[PDB]
Design a protein around this ligand. Sequence first.
Ligand SMILES: [Zn+2]
Ligand SMILES: [Zn+2]
Lengths: 49, 61, 66
Amino acid sequence: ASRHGQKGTIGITYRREDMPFTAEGIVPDLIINPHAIPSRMTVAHLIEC
Amino acid sequence: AKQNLYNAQGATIERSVTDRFTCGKCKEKKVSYYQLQTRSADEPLTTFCTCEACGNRWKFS
Amino acid sequence: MIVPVRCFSCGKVVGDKWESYLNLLQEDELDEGTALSRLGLKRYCCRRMILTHVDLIEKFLRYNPL
Ligand SMILES: [Zn+2]
Ligand SMILES: [Zn+2]
């Protein structure tokens, strides 16, 4: 969970070579779904990021 | 007598509207709403609906 | 705890750089952002670790076991 009440669990895991990746190669640690944003109305999470 | 007749007839709350949705039965845009949340905290408000072209009620999630 | 070896995101070895990053802030009086830059960590996934790692190991170490 975050510091904003976004509790959740791990669905599955991936290695880097099929994790998505950005131009500098910063491969992310973890990906959460966008739909947890609007209905939870958790703006400060985004601001913190 | 005029003041008494005014004081006889009572509450007339009037249901402020918008024009975005259409009626579930009449299908016209005179729609009025409200907000509050009913169930537990994990979900948002209820988005109550109230038509005024015919008086219909429905709801959106 | 020690610094981690090998940044979780990227994989570059970190841990050689720790005491260096310390003495860049002890006598050289240097600003720390430039300190990491002159330490040579230009991606930021690597950079977060040295910037945020806390060193509890010596606070453990000030006991007297055996
Ligand atoms: Zn209607
Ligand atoms: Zn890294």
